[PDB]
Amino acid sequence: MIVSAIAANALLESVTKFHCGVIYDYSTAEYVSYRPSDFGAYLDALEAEVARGGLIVFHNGHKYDVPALTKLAKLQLNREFHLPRENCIDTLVLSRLIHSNLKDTDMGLLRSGKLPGKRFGSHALEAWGYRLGEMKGEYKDDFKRMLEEQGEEYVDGMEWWNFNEEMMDYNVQDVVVTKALLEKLLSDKHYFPPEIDFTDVGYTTFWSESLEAVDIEHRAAWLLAKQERNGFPFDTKAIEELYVELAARRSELLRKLTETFGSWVFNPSSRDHIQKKLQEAGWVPTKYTDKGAPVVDDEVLEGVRVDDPEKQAAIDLIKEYLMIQKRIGQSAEGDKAWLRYVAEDGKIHGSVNPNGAVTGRATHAFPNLAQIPGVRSPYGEQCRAAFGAEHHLDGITGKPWVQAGIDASGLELRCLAHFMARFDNGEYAHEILNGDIHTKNQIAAELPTRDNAKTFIYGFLYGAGDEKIGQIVGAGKERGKELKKKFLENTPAIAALRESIQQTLVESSQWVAGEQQVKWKRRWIKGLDGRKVHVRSPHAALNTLLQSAGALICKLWIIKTEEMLVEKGLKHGWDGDFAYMAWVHDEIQVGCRTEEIAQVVIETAQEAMRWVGDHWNFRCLLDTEGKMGPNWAICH
Amino acid sequence: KIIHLTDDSFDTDVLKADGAILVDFWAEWCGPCKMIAPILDEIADEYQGKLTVAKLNIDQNPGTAPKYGIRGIPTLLLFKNGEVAATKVGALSKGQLKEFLDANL
């Protein structure tokens, strides 16, 4: 096993030159420093550990280091360099796996004065140096202050322009933190057994003798990192033709909404507006917002009735206006608007954090690819059309690629059937397969319509009170208790589900001054792969359990699907046959060169989904549904 | 003896009115205007024949004030044949107004 970290001139998207890199070998117990004229030997040193079947330790290597060293080797050395996914370890991923509950952990770290306020809960290399006590300083700061006593100034991120001896010393600093952080993660015996000193093993022993969660997360991080580099093809012209239809509508709406109110200036998106208005048109607020004056409150606006017809009719103009700002602020004027993120390949490369959550459901940002308005939401149809494989060319024919959208068919309710198959012997599970589970929940909870059962089952499982439940039948917090208790009597298994599991984490509970001081057995629920999935209050926790199952199911699902597609003969990327464009929890969007490839993609995903269920011996049956088409509005 | 102006009746009562028209660009909730409102009442009474005194509440007539560049209130505008002859912003006195108008009269 070797440990390293590198320093380049820029980010993964325009890096040009390799500066330095340090390699600590556990077998040699000694570091080795590299320099710009030593880039070639650096790649061989990594190849040598691959030949031995050892391991290579990087921080964020799956997402940056490994693809950058592949990219740098092509333009600088003109050689092909591809670190095998099996021979790579990412401390960042393990940190996100092992220490997903950092947010609490920092409380004691704050008391010490050892952890910066800007580096709270962060999983960056330097942020961990302060946690372990290895930060003698930071390269960026030993650069700025020393530039003063040299004359010349500082430009935002110029410390990486040129190879400097201070970078070479802080390049070591990043390596020793990676090593100590690795051993800090290897010292967690829940994930890494004591019987195996993983610091001196081959890759073959590392993955299997480690917890299964260790393997998936590195497979998940590697695949999704490929997805970011693949990117999502984007029709720039289409979104441009929308801002025109929106800005014109905004100005036309703004004009009509300035005839209704004067000044001494009507504001599009201000909170000091409705606060000044409606309570002058004859509207007395039903619900307020905190220390002073109610917020925008989109909810009440639908029900605001004022005796002024013009003011009343203007309410719906406000409803549209605010929404127009939302799409615009997401598609054009936002600091993280889509038009700002289109790369020079005609694609949007939205990033994704693998286990950036307690449960394992990922997070998307810059731009949040997982919040694009739905086709049911206004103008979402046009929005979804802007994200499509058709908006990509082709390596040869040029004929637009076809998109394949496959989602997990009702994963949440089937996950519920799996954990409750422990109490009903597959009763509820068969109701899924037999169909109309929302019809049974309707009968069990005594709801008038099937749609009311749908909004019930999800709210009840996740800890909704009685207001959302009461508003279903046009009531308040009153109606809810009898709706929840009746469902419990008609579905004992669900009640029995929360019995053994919720009493598996407690010995006895106790209320002290309004705070439950529960004596825990373990403040963490085990996931499908043995990882720690904490919760908070034992009053529900089920929501955490089900979402953990679902997110862990899809994570393995998208891994095996790609694994089978590669095994069948398909090549991953825009230069091969298919390319992952976006992963959104229970649905995925895959680009495909021909319709024939897309059909295989759909079938393989179903084959992988049954494979996952057999793998973890899932009590319930998992199915998926695929849609073929040009873009995303079609795949959903 | 005081004229109330709207936006519609600002064109006829002021712009098409021969003679000096003194307009108070005031508002419901402002301080220096509440003090001079008694002042205009006696001036409107004394300058009967000479001056027409008028009041415009810019909270209900808010389209006129921007047109004449109303910076602060109360803003007194001496219209002379649709044109603004002299303007004064804020509070004031009667003897100083007398000196002011008779200089323009």
XYZ file of C-alpha atoms in Angstrom:
741
model
C 0.000 0.000 0.000
C 1.229 3.485 -0.988
C -0.127 6.904 0.033
C 0.087 9.999 -2.166
C -1.417 13.374 -3.102
C -0.456 15.710 -5.955
C -0.306 19.393 -6.874
C -1.234 20.657 -10.345
C -1.588 24.074 -11.943
C -5.396 24.221 -12.013
C -8.616 22.231 -11.621
C -9.640 19.068 -13.475
C -11.228 21.163 -16.238
C -8.156 23.051 -17.506
C -5.160 21.606 -15.669
C -2.106 21.748 -17.922
C 1.055 20.791 -16.019
C 2.112 18.433 -13.243
C 4.083 20.118 -10.473
C 4.853 17.706 -7.641
C 3.748 14.557 -5.810
C 4.926 12.575 -2.749
C 4.690 8.780 -2.316
C 4.914 7.121 1.112
C 5.472 3.357 0.904
C 4.413 1.272 3.904
C 6.887 -1.463 2.942
C 9.727 1.083 2.754
C 8.428 3.285 5.617
C 9.935 6.258 3.779
C 8.636 9.072 1.570
C 9.706 9.910 -1.991
C 9.399 13.419 -3.463
C 8.747 14.168 -7.144
C 9.169 17.328 -9.227
C 8.077 18.609 -12.689
C 10.940 16.750 -14.407
C 9.975 13.607 -12.437
C 6.351 13.292 -13.612
C 7.187 10.267 -15.778
C 8.659 8.188 -12.966
C 5.665 9.106 -10.806
C 3.247 7.250 -13.096
C 5.510 4.189 -13.113
C 5.662 4.174 -9.313
C 1.870 3.967 -9.329
C 1.990 1.243 -11.985
C 4.442 -0.723 -9.817
C 2.013 -0.869 -6.893
C -0.614 -2.080 -9.373
C 1.726 -4.849 -10.560
C 2.163 -6.045 -6.978
C -1.601 -5.941 -6.504
C -1.172 -3.420 -3.701
C -3.146 -0.235 -3.038
C -2.825 3.492 -3.775
C -4.173 6.001 -1.224
C -5.437 9.378 -2.479
C -7.704 12.051 -1.025
C -10.493 12.757 -3.526
C -8.430 10.704 -5.961
C -11.425 9.018 -7.581
C -12.817 12.392 -8.663
C -9.709 14.524 -9.277
C -6.270 12.933 -8.840
C -6.836 9.788 -10.921
C -8.595 11.483 -13.879
C -6.115 14.381 -13.775
C -3.131 12.008 -13.910
C -4.867 10.317 -16.839
C -5.390 13.704 -18.488
C -1.902 15.038 -17.750
C -0.232 11.890 -19.108
C -1.861 12.407 -22.520
C -0.755 15.983 -23.268
C 2.561 16.071 -21.353
C 3.878 12.519 -21.765
C 1.462 11.296 -24.477
C 1.019 8.014 -22.576
C -2.122 6.203 -21.445
C -2.501 6.108 -17.653
C -5.590 4.471 -16.112
C -5.461 3.496 -12.459
C -7.679 0.406 -12.043
C -10.665 1.148 -9.819
C -9.790 -1.893 -7.693
C -6.294 -0.535 -6.913
C -7.459 2.856 -5.598
C -8.587 4.084 -2.186
C -10.203 7.444 -1.428
C -9.924 8.680 2.161
C -12.563 11.300 1.317
C -15.095 8.587 0.459
C -14.319 6.585 3.596
C -14.548 9.801 5.605
C -18.007 10.362 4.127
C -18.791 6.694 4.821
C -17.345 6.259 8.318
C -17.868 9.805 9.611
C -21.229 10.767 8.130
C -22.221 11.999 11.620
C -19.625 14.767 11.763
C -22.176 17.543 12.370
C -22.563 16.535 16.016
C -18.923 15.425 16.382
C -17.748 19.001 15.755
C -19.361 20.258 18.992
C -16.463 18.955 21.085
C -14.006 19.906 18.349
C -15.372 23.460 18.591
C -14.855 23.614 22.367
C -11.162 22.831 21.906
C -10.435 25.686 19.540
C -8.741 23.121 17.293
C -11.180 23.334 14.367
C -11.660 26.442 12.221
C -15.132 27.880 11.792
C -14.672 27.844 8.014
C -13.590 24.185 8.260
C -16.470 22.864 10.358
C -17.518 19.325 9.448
C -15.627 19.581 6.158
C -13.919 16.508 4.731
C -11.109 18.388 2.981
C -7.559 17.206 3.635
C -6.556 20.330 5.561
C -9.791 20.288 7.591
C -8.809 16.861 8.946
C -5.251 17.951 9.729
C -6.588 20.153 12.517
C -8.756 17.276 13.773
C -5.763 14.931 14.035
C -3.241 17.651 14.900
C -1.065 17.600 11.790
C -1.630 21.110 10.353
C 1.606 23.063 10.683
C -0.065 25.617 8.412
C -1.580 25.832 4.945
C 0.186 26.306 1.617
C -2.185 29.061 0.522
C -1.395 31.173 3.601
C 2.363 30.588 3.753
C 2.202 31.900 0.176
C 0.096 35.046 0.668
C 1.988 36.437 3.670
C 5.370 35.682 2.094
C 4.301 37.497 -1.083
C 3.990 40.645 1.012
C 7.647 40.595 2.079
C 8.474 40.032 -1.584
C 6.605 42.994 -3.118
C 4.183 41.656 -5.724
C 0.502 41.123 -4.894
C -1.858 38.119 -5.005
C -4.482 36.992 -7.525
C -7.326 34.662 -6.513
C -5.683 31.259 -6.888
C -2.248 32.105 -8.277
C -0.303 29.964 -5.780
C -0.803 27.018 -8.161
C 0.529 28.814 -11.247
C 4.168 27.790 -10.786
C 6.213 25.141 -8.989
C 7.599 26.669 -5.791
C 9.653 25.091 -3.014
C 6.945 26.110 -0.525
C 4.397 24.072 -2.476
C 6.774 21.097 -2.492
C 6.938 21.282 1.321
C 3.166 21.636 1.724
C 2.724 18.888 -0.859
C 4.236 16.653 1.813
C 1.853 18.264 4.317
C -1.114 16.955 2.333
C 0.448 13.473 2.239
C 1.108 13.054 5.964
C -2.475 14.116 6.708
C -3.754 11.535 4.238
C -1.709 8.790 5.927
C -2.780 9.713 9.459
C -6.381 10.097 8.297
C -6.203 6.690 6.608
C -5.047 5.076 9.847
C -7.782 6.998 11.668
C -10.332 5.394 9.343
C -8.659 1.969 9.523
C -8.889 2.177 13.331
C -12.697 1.979 13.155
C -13.291 -1.719 13.773
C -16.946 -1.607 12.712
C -15.671 -1.130 9.143
C -12.106 -2.511 9.411
C -11.683 -5.666 11.526
C -8.706 -5.832 13.898
C -7.708 -9.325 12.724
C -6.413 -7.762 9.480
C -3.810 -4.993 9.441
C -5.096 -3.407 6.239
C -2.052 -1.098 6.079
C -0.028 -3.964 4.531
C -2.441 -6.002 2.404
C -3.143 -6.531 -1.250
C -6.192 -5.098 -2.948
C -7.705 -8.593 -3.089
C -7.753 -8.827 0.712
C -8.676 -5.188 1.330
C -12.121 -5.136 -0.282
C -13.373 -8.487 1.008
C -12.039 -8.276 4.572
C -13.449 -4.756 4.862
C -17.100 -3.978 5.379
C -19.165 -4.238 2.200
C -20.000 -0.522 2.479
C -16.305 0.239 1.900
C -16.394 -1.471 -1.499
C -19.656 0.022 -2.801
C -18.701 3.578 -1.859
C -15.479 3.351 -3.841
C -17.379 1.781 -6.728
C -20.081 4.424 -6.341
C -17.601 7.303 -6.185
C -15.674 6.020 -9.208
C -18.802 5.630 -11.346
C -20.392 8.958 -10.433
C -17.054 10.693 -11.004
C -17.222 9.256 -14.507
C -20.766 10.630 -14.791
C -19.582 14.161 -13.992
C -16.903 13.919 -16.685
C -19.505 12.550 -19.086
C -21.813 15.452 -18.266
C -25.376 16.121 -19.372
C -25.840 17.353 -22.979
C -27.498 20.764 -23.045
C -29.572 22.695 -25.606
C -28.372 26.231 -24.926
C -30.582 27.736 -27.639
C -33.711 26.236 -26.070
C -33.170 27.795 -22.634
C -32.316 31.101 -24.319
C -35.677 30.960 -26.116
C -37.283 30.610 -22.663
C -35.673 33.559 -20.883
C -37.094 35.632 -23.744
C -40.597 34.313 -23.110
C -40.101 34.802 -19.348
C -38.394 38.204 -19.193
C -41.037 39.598 -21.538
C -43.707 38.020 -19.339
C -41.994 39.357 -16.216
C -41.908 42.905 -17.580
C -45.485 42.679 -18.856
C -46.569 41.309 -15.467
C -44.455 43.924 -13.682
C -46.260 46.635 -15.663
C -49.741 45.420 -14.719
C -48.603 44.962 -11.101
C -47.396 48.571 -10.932
C -50.742 50.008 -12.010
C -52.262 48.398 -8.904
C -49.731 49.951 -6.471
C -47.849 53.269 -6.473
C -44.779 54.537 -4.630
C -43.094 57.840 -3.704
C -41.340 50.888 -6.505
C -43.023 47.504 -6.960
C -40.510 44.769 -6.167
C -40.472 41.390 -7.916
C -39.157 39.237 -5.052
C -39.272 41.245 -1.820
C -40.701 40.293 1.557
C -41.396 43.940 2.455
C -44.012 43.988 -0.314
C -46.863 41.663 0.621
C -46.140 42.839 4.166
C -46.990 46.348 2.964
C -49.813 45.037 0.767
C -52.852 42.761 1.316
C -53.071 44.088 4.886
C -54.252 47.214 3.085
C -56.563 45.350 0.673
C -58.512 43.822 3.568
C -56.520 40.680 4.426
C -55.795 39.729 8.042
C -53.045 37.057 8.189
C -54.139 33.584 9.336
C -50.535 32.429 9.892
C -47.455 34.523 10.683
C -43.691 33.985 10.242
C -41.472 34.331 13.337
C -40.255 37.495 15.074
C -42.047 40.027 12.891
C -44.399 40.024 9.876
C -45.344 37.010 7.729
C -43.098 35.684 4.951
C -44.075 35.465 1.257
C -46.318 32.512 2.185
C -47.166 31.012 -1.202
C -49.713 28.805 0.605
C -52.074 31.473 1.971
C -51.928 33.407 -1.315
C -54.125 30.758 -2.955
C -56.718 31.438 -0.236
C -56.298 35.205 0.257
C -59.684 36.865 -0.341
C -59.821 40.662 -0.425
C -62.854 42.803 -1.194
C -60.847 44.756 -3.794
C -61.373 42.919 -7.123
C -58.257 44.445 -8.681
C -56.159 43.558 -5.634
C -57.782 40.113 -5.555
C -57.177 39.518 -9.262
C -53.618 40.785 -8.768
C -52.914 37.934 -6.321
C -52.830 35.362 -9.127
C -50.549 37.716 -11.056
C -48.209 37.649 -8.054
C -48.391 33.843 -7.960
C -47.273 33.636 -11.590
C -44.699 36.411 -11.191
C -42.880 34.796 -8.259
C -42.771 31.504 -10.168
C -41.403 33.255 -13.264
C -38.565 34.581 -11.104
C -37.917 31.022 -9.885
C -37.290 29.552 -13.348
C -35.375 32.662 -14.423
C -33.313 32.621 -11.226
C -32.515 28.996 -12.058
C -32.113 29.244 -15.851
C -30.499 32.653 -16.393
C -30.078 35.240 -13.636
C -28.988 32.894 -10.847
C -25.389 32.757 -9.705
C -25.801 28.988 -10.223
C -28.070 29.265 -13.251
C -27.817 26.656 -15.995
C -26.590 29.016 -18.736
C -23.518 29.768 -16.600
C -22.584 26.080 -16.258
C -22.696 24.958 -19.904
C -19.200 23.749 -20.754
C -17.453 24.183 -24.108
C -18.569 20.670 -25.128
C -22.255 21.655 -25.072
C -22.823 19.810 -21.789
C -23.679 20.600 -18.162
C -21.302 18.777 -15.792
C -23.316 18.723 -12.575
C -21.370 17.416 -9.564
C -22.700 14.823 -7.112
C -21.663 13.848 -3.575
C -21.870 10.042 -3.107
C -22.558 9.443 0.597
C -23.168 13.085 1.423
C -25.925 12.040 3.823
C -26.704 9.866 6.828
C -28.780 7.477 4.730
C -26.548 7.436 1.640
C -28.893 9.264 -0.735
C -26.648 11.552 -2.741
C -26.669 15.349 -3.060
C -26.339 17.373 -6.277
C -25.138 20.955 -6.705
C -23.315 23.348 -9.055
C -25.839 23.063 -10.598
C -28.324 20.986 -8.606
C -29.203 18.580 -11.413
C -31.720 16.867 -9.094
C -34.121 19.807 -8.708
C -34.882 20.619 -12.360
C -38.629 21.393 -12.476
C -40.849 18.471 -13.392
C -42.863 18.290 -16.585
C -45.985 18.656 -14.433
C -44.656 21.905 -12.997
C -45.113 24.935 -15.287
C -42.414 25.429 -17.934
C -40.757 22.271 -16.619
C -41.643 20.521 -19.870
C -39.433 22.991 -21.732
C -36.826 22.780 -18.963
C -36.641 18.985 -19.085
C -36.340 19.220 -22.877
C -33.143 21.238 -22.454
C -31.492 18.238 -20.731
C -31.313 15.436 -23.281
C -28.923 13.076 -25.012
C -30.364 14.404 -28.280
C -28.617 17.680 -27.414
C -25.367 15.755 -27.950
C -23.710 15.038 -31.290
C -21.988 11.713 -32.008
C -18.421 10.562 -32.509
C -19.166 9.373 -36.050
C -22.571 9.655 -37.711
C -23.445 12.796 -35.766
C -26.968 11.445 -35.408
C -28.186 12.514 -31.941
C -27.866 9.910 -29.201
C -31.034 8.460 -27.681
C -31.764 8.732 -23.964
C -32.864 5.903 -21.659
C -34.645 6.801 -18.423
C -35.064 3.980 -15.894
C -36.559 4.415 -12.416
C -37.092 2.107 -9.441
C -40.768 1.131 -9.464
C -42.193 2.166 -6.088
C -38.975 1.479 -4.206
C -40.142 3.054 -0.929
C -43.204 0.858 -0.400
C -41.341 -2.305 -1.397
C -38.567 -1.419 1.037
C -41.290 -1.172 3.673
C -42.557 -4.617 2.666
C -39.052 -6.041 3.100
C -38.530 -4.909 6.699
C -42.107 -5.851 7.608
C -41.837 -9.252 5.932
C -40.075 -10.093 9.208
C -43.464 -9.851 10.970
C -46.144 -10.787 8.399
C -44.412 -13.602 6.456
C -44.572 -11.854 3.094
C -48.199 -10.707 3.398
C -47.765 -7.015 2.581
C -45.034 -7.867 0.067
C -47.432 -9.919 -2.065
C -49.926 -7.051 -2.078
C -47.281 -5.033 -3.934
C -46.803 -7.719 -6.597
C -50.519 -8.510 -6.749
C -50.908 -4.747 -7.236
C -52.899 -1.833 -5.846
C -51.050 -1.456 -2.555
C -52.445 2.077 -2.300
C -55.874 0.465 -2.560
C -55.108 -1.781 0.419
C -53.694 1.139 2.418
C -56.903 2.978 1.547
C -58.974 0.137 3.004
C -56.634 -0.282 5.987
C -56.583 3.397 7.007
C -60.221 4.054 5.999
C -59.616 6.807 3.436
C -62.275 7.846 0.906
C -60.070 7.989 -2.214
C -56.994 6.094 -3.363
C -55.082 9.360 -3.846
C -55.687 10.190 -0.177
C -54.066 6.861 0.673
C -51.005 7.782 -1.403
C -50.429 11.065 0.420
C -51.142 9.227 3.684
C -48.683 6.328 3.441
C -45.706 8.601 2.742
C -46.564 11.224 5.350
C -47.321 8.703 8.093
C -44.145 6.685 7.491
C -41.907 9.749 7.636
C -43.274 11.388 10.781
C -45.971 13.832 9.680
C -48.178 15.107 12.454
C -51.907 15.524 11.898
C -52.238 18.884 10.104
C -51.156 17.615 6.678
C -53.253 14.532 7.427
C -56.166 16.649 8.661
C -56.035 19.013 5.697
C -56.689 15.985 3.463
C -60.291 15.896 4.690
C -60.472 19.676 5.201
C -59.608 19.819 8.908
C -56.698 20.576 11.243
C -54.533 18.800 13.801
C -57.698 17.284 15.309
C -58.361 14.752 12.546
C -55.283 12.538 12.353
C -55.077 10.359 15.456
C -57.988 8.112 14.452
C -56.659 7.960 10.893
C -53.245 6.793 12.125
C -54.448 4.358 14.811
C -56.968 2.681 12.481
C -54.240 2.023 9.919
C -52.132 0.495 12.692
C -54.910 -1.889 13.729
C -55.561 -3.046 10.159
C -51.823 -3.413 9.391
C -50.236 -5.000 12.484
C -46.982 -5.793 10.687
C -46.209 -2.090 10.229
C -46.788 -1.578 13.952
C -44.788 -4.717 14.752
C -42.044 -3.402 12.449
C -41.461 -0.407 14.709
C -41.672 -2.714 17.728
C -38.610 -4.983 17.541
C -36.421 -2.506 15.639
C -37.153 0.603 17.708
C -36.631 -1.494 20.854
C -33.382 -2.876 19.435
C -31.680 0.491 20.034
C -32.982 1.191 23.544
C -32.874 -0.384 26.990
C -35.157 2.088 28.763
C -36.144 5.676 27.972
C -36.675 8.611 30.305
C -37.979 12.172 30.073
C -35.903 14.864 31.811
C -37.194 18.462 31.636
C -38.920 17.786 28.325
C -35.893 16.077 26.753
C -35.958 12.307 26.320
C -32.746 10.925 27.859
C -33.122 7.477 26.243
C -30.561 4.907 27.344
C -29.352 3.697 23.970
C -28.009 0.329 22.946
C -26.404 1.891 19.865
C -27.017 5.367 18.419
C -26.882 3.939 14.877
C -29.110 1.756 12.668
C -27.366 -0.826 10.507
C -27.854 -0.431 6.771
C -28.020 -3.069 4.079
C -24.197 -3.272 3.985
C -23.357 -2.918 7.688
C -22.516 0.801 7.595
C -23.563 3.085 10.454
C -26.776 5.007 9.679
C -27.603 7.194 12.676
C -30.993 8.810 13.263
C -31.932 11.158 16.143
C -35.188 10.370 17.919
C -36.549 6.834 18.368
C -40.078 8.202 17.882
C -39.938 7.234 14.182
C -36.492 6.395 12.742
C -38.353 4.224 10.201
C -38.046 7.036 7.645
C -34.268 6.843 8.069
C -34.353 3.051 7.742
C -36.445 3.023 4.557
C -34.581 5.838 2.804
C -31.303 4.128 3.744
C -32.491 0.909 2.131
C -33.669 2.755 -0.979
C -30.520 4.826 -1.418
C -28.271 1.821 -0.807
C -30.357 -0.223 -3.275
C -30.046 2.306 -6.109
C -26.344 2.871 -5.397
C -25.561 -0.812 -5.941
C -28.128 -0.894 -8.750
C -26.439 1.747 -10.903
C -23.090 0.055 -10.208
C -24.115 -3.421 -11.355
C -26.027 -2.068 -14.359
C -22.884 -0.372 -15.653
C -20.840 -3.416 -14.625
C -23.080 -5.730 -16.655
C -23.167 -3.314 -19.595
C -19.362 -3.233 -19.614
C -19.261 -7.017 -19.205
C -21.683 -7.575 -22.094
C -19.318 -5.577 -24.318
C -20.461 -1.962 -24.131
C -17.939 0.841 -23.641
C -18.647 3.705 -21.240
C -18.409 7.301 -22.436
C -19.390 9.531 -25.321
C -16.772 7.715 -27.433
C -18.201 4.262 -26.742
C -21.873 3.292 -26.660
C -23.499 4.826 -23.544
C -22.812 7.541 -20.989
C -24.295 8.227 -17.572
C -25.703 11.751 -17.586
C -27.538 12.039 -14.261
C -28.407 9.872 -11.254
C -31.424 11.109 -9.292
C -32.038 8.822 -6.302
C -34.488 6.239 -7.663
C -34.277 7.210 -11.363
C -31.335 7.456 -13.769
C -30.771 9.157 -17.136
C -28.428 7.276 -19.500
C -27.330 8.469 -22.938
C -27.148 5.856 -25.693
C -25.637 5.994 -29.182
C -28.382 3.911 -30.845
C -31.891 2.805 -29.924
C -30.606 -0.783 -29.818
C -28.108 0.130 -27.102
C -30.822 1.928 -25.128
C -33.039 -1.157 -25.217
C -30.177 -3.198 -23.756
C -29.647 -0.504 -21.119
C -33.295 -0.790 -20.038
C -33.192 -4.600 -19.861
C -29.843 -4.664 -18.061
C -31.046 -2.244 -15.375
C -33.958 -4.572 -14.635
C -31.551 -7.513 -14.597
C -29.314 -5.620 -12.187
C -32.293 -4.685 -10.000
C -33.240 -8.357 -9.537
C -29.585 -9.131 -8.888
C -29.504 -6.561 -6.078
C -32.609 -8.130 -4.525
C -31.111 -11.604 -4.638
C -27.779 -10.270 -3.354
C -29.195 -8.858 -0.116
C -31.913 -11.549 -0.152
C -34.560 -8.848 -0.268
C -37.845 -10.281 0.968
C -39.843 -8.168 -1.509
C -39.516 -8.128 -5.290
C -37.844 -5.142 -6.963
C -38.824 -4.000 -10.458
C -37.936 -1.085 -12.712
C -39.458 0.652 -15.727
C -37.585 2.192 -18.656
C -38.521 4.876 -21.180
C -36.746 5.489 -24.481
C -36.586 8.918 -26.082
C -34.605 12.013 -27.081
C -34.488 13.880 -23.767
C -35.578 14.005 -20.117
C -39.150 15.261 -20.545
C -39.620 11.985 -22.459
C -37.888 9.679 -19.958
C -40.324 10.692 -17.212
C -60.202 77.811 0.541
C -57.904 74.915 -0.417
C -57.941 72.884 -3.671
C -57.580 69.091 -3.734
C -55.879 67.749 -6.859
C -55.906 64.240 -8.283
C -53.890 62.974 -11.217
C -56.762 63.641 -13.626
C -57.682 67.034 -12.157
C -54.065 68.178 -12.051
C -54.167 68.986 -15.761
C -57.203 71.282 -15.501
C -56.897 72.808 -12.032
C -53.161 73.532 -12.422
C -51.757 73.190 -15.944
C -54.698 74.940 -17.660
C -55.291 77.439 -14.841
C -54.269 81.038 -15.400
C -52.573 82.587 -12.400
C -50.200 81.520 -9.649
C -50.982 78.015 -8.363
C -49.252 76.917 -5.137
C -49.277 73.101 -4.866
C -48.331 71.248 -1.682
C -46.871 67.836 -2.570
C -47.578 66.216 0.790
C -48.536 62.828 2.225
C -50.620 61.254 4.973
C -47.737 60.299 7.296
C -45.141 63.058 7.068
C -44.026 65.617 9.601
C -43.074 69.021 8.152
C -46.232 69.023 6.010
C -48.530 68.514 8.999
C -47.091 71.744 10.424
C -47.477 73.915 7.306
C -51.035 72.804 6.523
C -52.380 75.525 8.870
C -49.981 77.979 7.180
C -51.414 77.434 3.700
C -54.956 77.888 5.046
C -54.334 81.486 6.063
C -52.210 82.212 2.977
C -54.951 80.816 0.734
C -57.314 83.160 2.570
C -55.075 86.236 2.345
C -54.011 85.745 -1.288
C -57.629 85.421 -2.440
C -57.759 86.597 -6.034
C -53.987 86.417 -6.374
C -53.123 82.815 -5.510
C -54.853 79.458 -5.752
C -53.681 77.050 -3.041
C -53.884 73.331 -3.766
C -52.872 70.124 -1.989
C -51.806 66.836 -3.591
C -51.500 63.715 -1.437
C -48.811 61.675 -3.215
C -49.851 58.446 -1.483
C -53.149 58.549 -3.407
C -51.938 60.724 -6.323
C -48.487 59.165 -6.861
C -48.089 59.605 -10.617
C -47.877 63.373 -10.650
C -45.122 63.830 -8.049
C -42.503 61.834 -10.040
C -43.173 63.987 -13.118
C -42.074 67.178 -11.342
C -39.075 65.524 -9.678
C -40.432 65.742 -6.122
C -37.324 65.152 -3.973
C -38.587 65.851 -0.457
C -41.922 66.741 1.046
C -43.714 69.016 1.553
C -42.764 70.456 -1.856
C -44.350 73.781 -2.830
C -44.600 74.411 -6.593
C -45.659 77.833 -7.901
C -47.224 77.087 -11.289
C -47.388 80.010 -13.747
C -49.323 79.034 -16.903
C -48.672 75.313 -16.645
C -44.993 76.064 -16.021
C -43.347 75.874 -12.587
C -42.083 79.349 -11.697
C -40.556 78.781 -8.255
C -40.306 75.748 -5.975
C -39.650 75.310 -2.264
C -39.256 72.002 -0.412
C -40.012 71.487 3.269
C -41.582 73.620 5.957
C -41.592 77.419 5.857
C -42.956 80.625 7.408
C -45.600 83.141 6.373
C -43.430 86.264 6.351
C -40.783 84.466 4.316
C -43.441 83.161 1.928
C -44.799 86.713 1.601
C -41.337 87.954 0.627
C -41.031 84.976 -1.720
C -44.316 85.433 -3.608
C -44.360 89.244 -3.851
C -40.921 88.919 -5.436
C -42.494 86.688 -8.091
C -45.754 88.683 -8.155
